[PDB]
Design a protein around this ligand. Sequence first.
Ligand SMILES: CCCCCCCCCCCCCCCCCCCC(=O)O[C@H](COC(=O)CCCCCCCCCCCCCC)COP(=O)(O)OCCN
Ligand SMILES: CCCCCCCCCCCCCCCCCCCC(=O)O[C@H](COC(=O)CCCCCCCCCCCCCC)COP(=O)(O)OCCN
Ligand SMILES: [Cl-]
Ligand SMILES: [Cl-]
Ligand SMILES: [Mg+2]
Ligand SMILES: [Zn+2]
Ligand SMILES: [Zn+2]
Lengths: 304, 307
Amino acid sequence: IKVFETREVQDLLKAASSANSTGDARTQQIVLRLLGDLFKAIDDLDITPDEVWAGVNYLNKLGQDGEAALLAAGLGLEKYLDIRMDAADAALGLDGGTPRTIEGPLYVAGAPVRDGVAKIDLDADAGAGPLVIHGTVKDLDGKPVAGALVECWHANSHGFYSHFDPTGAQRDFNLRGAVRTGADGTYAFRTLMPVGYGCPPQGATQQLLDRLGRHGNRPAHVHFFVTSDGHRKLTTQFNIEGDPLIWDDFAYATREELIPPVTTKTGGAALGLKADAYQDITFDFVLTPRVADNQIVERPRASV
Amino acid sequence: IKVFETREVQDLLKAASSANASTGDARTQQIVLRLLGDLFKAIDDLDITPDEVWAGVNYLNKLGQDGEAALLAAGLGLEKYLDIRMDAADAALGLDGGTPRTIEGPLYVAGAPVRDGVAKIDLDADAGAGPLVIHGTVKDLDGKPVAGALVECWHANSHGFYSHFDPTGAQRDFNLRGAVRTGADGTYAFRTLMPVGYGCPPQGATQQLLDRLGRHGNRPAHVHFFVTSDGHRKLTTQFNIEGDPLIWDDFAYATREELIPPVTTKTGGAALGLKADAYQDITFDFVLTPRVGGADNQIVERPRASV
Ligand SMILES: CCCCCCCCCCCCCCCCCCCC(=O)O[C@H](COC(=O)CCCCCCCCCCCCCC)COP(=O)(O)OCCN
Ligand SMILES: CCCCCCCCCCCCCCCCCCCC(=O)O[C@H](COC(=O)CCCCCCCCCCCCCC)COP(=O)(O)OCCN
Ligand SMILES: [Cl-]
Ligand SMILES: [Cl-]
Ligand SMILES: [Mg+2]
Ligand SMILES: [Zn+2]
Ligand SMILES: [Zn+2]
């Protein structure tokens, strides 16, 4: 049985997506398209009322859990946005900088900004060894970028982020920091080694992933923003070398270029670290110039 | 710029919708693959920006936090669409001539009092609502009265609020909710008060999106019914109160020409246990369809409140 092409369905689609205020034309356009696509899929796949109401109930749970942005990551929609942004840059030759990858839903605004270097582990974590991340911010010609704002955030040894830790064990901005580069363009973060993240086991995202036969885990990783006057804003990450989930990220974010080598070094005491032996990661950023920033993204983000 | 047909996007879609030790539910994988693929293609076709996507993601969070996803299903015509598909299936099977179905809406409550033949279902005083008597017969497709049918009724008060969903807390359990079991003559009657039309919660996610579309979130005054009977399919329907100005402008698209019975003012209300001599009277008949193959091929399972 197929009804999508009937006049009644077409009229219903038009009424539901248009004004009886005149409304927002762009919202009307997008709703018409998405509602029409949904109706056609229901027609094509013979999706039953019971199935629709189960999906409607799932949307209630998803929003109740506050997890719609987590599901956006888990279904590859967030990665898809990067694919489209990558293709846009390639058409304009705005590639060759450090590659972007997904932001994820766990950024928090307001971390204290330091000149040159920041120590960002505030809470003791006996399951996480000391880690130093350092490098240079440069332009496409290799010249250092001064005054760039490099922001970092990552998880603790239980896979939890500050401001999102269900045990309440972390202080504000634990494992979150911002460095303002000086004239030499260099940055360094002094922190602890992250462990991979997993979706809240009872949450809506994991519920649907379970139905798909999929896990909800990420490899260990570290997030970055880089903001600089005259350069486009970089959103990226890198993964911790050797993680078994490195090519099995439930958020599809891993890139071969974003897996820097990890090396063990000594002398941690002189760098203010909690142990003599520590892990060291060199990671350089290459920024691209503006045109106006045609790829910066505005989305809801936590703050304190 | 269009990327949907690239190998990378196609591989991403297949990975996101399929299993990685556990094998998953094939039907869920099938539906996710289709809906996710359609979403990716619409984003490509309409050049939907990251900012727009994240605003939509944020709206889904608000929708579920408000517990309004089923209200939006009604307001965007998805609930009506399900009835259109059920109607076409019935027409293909020759299940015609019954009372037309229409949408359930999200405000049913299980457990209301059941009486034989007649029920007075207004429990809370409501000075803004006059007495209303709804009566008729339940019949089959041969015009024969159906005995033992369960006719369930629920509707709003003069503020447009339903019991168990009244944010002022002013209504007791099962106010304006009740069920009548027909006798041998197939007759039912409800004694109640006149409903007023419903409006979406003004601060809720459903009204927020309706506002962006330039649309109101109001329903005309109406009364809901379930009718259940051994050997007949479960009827979900309503009727609208004649003369309501919103009667053909329901934000949930539920009005049908056959479901607008005439309203007549009558006297003698005291003898019917009513609060006034003058009352409004509505004759409304139900015609049921048979349960072919012993199975009800259109009964719907969805979350429903209870007490
Ligand atoms: C271009 C436009 C395309 C549409 C755009 C819509 C918005 C974006 C959508 C992105 C694509 C992904 C959609 C994913 C929907 C997942 C729904 C899962 C529901 C679910 O778990 O159902 C179980 C039964 O399964 C079943 O019944 C099988 C699955 C049936 C799912 C039907 C969904 C239809 C759509 C209805 C909502 C509208 C869209 C929602 C995203 C519940 O059952 P349980 O009780 O046993 O266990 C759970 C405990 N209660
Ligand atoms: C409920 C169950 C029953 C119905 C299910 C139907 C599902 C699909 C069928 C059609 C319905 C489409 C629904 C679209 C929802 C979002 C639209 C309104 C969002 C909104 O108010 O955005 C405004 C801006 O508009 C804009 O920016 C315009 C663009 C917004 C639309 C983009 C949609 C993208 C897809 C997202 C869903 C999939 C993700 C999860 C798989 C205000 O926002 P603001 O300016 O105040 O900003 C704050 C956030 N930053
Ligand atoms: Cl009684
Ligand atoms: Cl409200
Ligand atoms: Mg007839
Ligand atoms: Zn992360
Ligand atoms: Zn109603």
